[PDB]
Amino acid sequence: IVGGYTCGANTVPYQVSLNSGYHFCGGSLINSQWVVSAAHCYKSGIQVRLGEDNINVVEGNEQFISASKSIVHPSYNSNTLNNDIMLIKLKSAASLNSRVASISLPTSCASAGTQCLISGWGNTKSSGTSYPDVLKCLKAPILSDSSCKSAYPGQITSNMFCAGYLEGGKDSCQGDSGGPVVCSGKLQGIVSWGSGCAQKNKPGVYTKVCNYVSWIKQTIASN
Numbered sequence: 001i002v003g004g005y006t007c008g009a010n011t012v013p014y015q016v017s018l019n020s021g022y023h024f025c026g027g028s029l030i031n032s033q034w035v036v037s038a039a040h041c042y043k044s045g046i047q048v049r050l051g052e053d054n055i056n057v058v059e060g061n062e063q064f065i066s067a068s069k070s071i072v073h074p075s076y077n078s079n080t081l082n083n084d085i086m087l088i089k090l091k092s093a094a095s096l097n098s099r100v101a102s103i104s105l106p107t108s109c110a111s112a113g114t115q116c117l118i119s120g121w122g123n124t125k126s127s128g129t130s131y132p133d134v135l136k137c138l139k140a141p142i143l144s145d146s147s148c149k150s151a152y153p154g155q156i157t158s159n160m161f162c163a164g165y166l167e168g169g170k171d172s173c174q175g176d177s178g179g180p181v182v183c184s185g186k187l188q189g190i191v192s193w194g195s196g197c198a199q200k201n202k203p204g205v206y207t208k209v210c211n212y213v214s215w216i217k218q219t220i221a222s223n
């Protein structure tokens with residue numbers, strides 16, 4: 001997260017860190033057994049880390065649970081990043097508490113102009129590299145479809161939306177991949193892609209979760 005703020009420990013209790021020997025992506029806990037992340041975060045050997053603030057120190061509220069199965073969306077296209085969504089099943093159910101909590105799925109899509117919360121442990125620099133240990137947060141509005149398509153001609157599908165600031169300075173970044181965009185108490189986006197971070201006229205692009213609720217519900221009903 002570039003240009004954001006320190007969230008405060010466990011104040012984003014649905015935020016998870018995906019670990020394969022190191023943090024490599026975020027995700028969102030949607031019930032005690034399932035995490036939503038980005039398809040581009042797929043790899044084998046994932047451990048889901050819940051209850052995290054400082055990802056380099058065991059502070060006492062963590063739950064570390066290995067994934068039993070990952071399911072990349074059947075239509076994910078890694079060339080266009082269309083359908084950039086993946087479900088991860090936990091080997092055992094998380095213990096839900098005030099610091100480890102699920103985020104509701106949307107029933108309707110969010111509106112342009114709505115302010116959302118984006119969070120993660122990704123790079124905090126727009127030029128260069130600095131990775132934080134504690135969870136960072138950003139308030140960012142959903143941008144109009146027109147401005148999103150103008151920023152990325154030929155590349156925005158109906159399964160994507162832009163959020164952030166066309167003037168730059170504030171954005172998600174590498175390492176935030178797969179993490180949540182929460183608007184009005186619902187998981188409306190997944191950190192997906194962009195062009196650099198916090199650059200002028202290149203806002204973050206996010207998977208439009210409301211288009212995937214039927215697939216999520218069906219998949220968790222049979223796995």
Ligand SMILES: Nc1ccc(CNC(=O)[C@@H]2CCCN2C(=O)[C@H](N)Cc2ccccc2)cn1
Pocket residue numbers: 040171172173174175176177191192193194195196197198203204205
């Ligand atoms: N504002 C941001 C930007 C990035 C991220 C994290 N996500 C990534 O870094 C993903 C993972 C795979 C590569 N990637 C990218 O985004 C490529 N730049 C896409 C691209 C490729 C080619 C042309 C234009 C664009 C979050 N917030």
Ligand SMILES: [Ca+2]
Pocket residue numbers: 052053054055056057058059062
């Ligand atoms: Ca920790």
